[PDB]
Design a protein around this ligand. Structure first.
Ligand SMILES: Cc1nnc(CNc2nc(Cl)cnc2N)n1C1CC1
Length: 167
């Protein structure tokens, strides 16, 4: 039993809710919140911008030190950093950004990072300002992630479409 509330069950291990991931993280304080990161960990907008703002920019400060030491992430890759006031840990995962021309096949590699964590609160990777079809992202999630994932979808209209079209 865990503390996630109000989710619709899609599969054995994938759950979905219309929610603001920031507000959901603040209430649940999950072990892991996933950030929709880019390779530079520049958290300017979308989910990343929202999460970083909620940490009062502490996420960005930590991220800048990470990059200065380690260099950029790979598209499809990830790193574990602090969850600050939102979670124990933040798993920064880089899905391909279609608006930069990155290969959508890398979306499966991106979701594979979730399998290193037993339970996660997450957005749909490569959705929103990353330009991919969220219906496709949900399908890849369900077909790739085997650990327990709680998906937060900000947009109510999109949430309803994802549920109604789910096979
Ligand atoms: C549309 C849409 N609906 N949900 C998402 C991603 N998930 C979340 N993003 C935020 Cl900013 C807050 N809370 C979330 N759960 N998107 C993408 C970024 C454009």
């Amino acid at each position: 039993v865990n503390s996630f509330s109000g989710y619709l069950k899609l599969t054995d291990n994938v759950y979905i809710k219309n929610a603001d991931i920031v507000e959901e993280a603040k209430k649940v304080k999950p072990t892991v919140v996933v950030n929709a990161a880019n390779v530079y960990l520049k958290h300017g907008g979308g989910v990343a911008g929202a999460l970083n703002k909620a940490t009062n920019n502490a996420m960005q400060v930590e991220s800048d030190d990470y990059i200065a030491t380690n260099g950029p992430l790979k598209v499809g890759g990830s790193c574990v950093l602090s969850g600050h006031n939102l979670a124990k840990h933040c798993l920064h995962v880089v899905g391909p950004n279609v608006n930069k021309g990155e290969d959508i096949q890398l979306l499966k590699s991106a979701y594979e990072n979730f399998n290193q964590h037993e339970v996660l609160l997450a957005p749909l990777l490569s959705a929103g300002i990353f330009g991919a079809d969220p219906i496709h992202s949900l399908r890849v999630c369900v077909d790739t992630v085997r650990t327990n994932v709680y998906l937060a979808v900000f947009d109510k209209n999109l949430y309803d479409k994802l549920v109604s079209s789910f096979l």
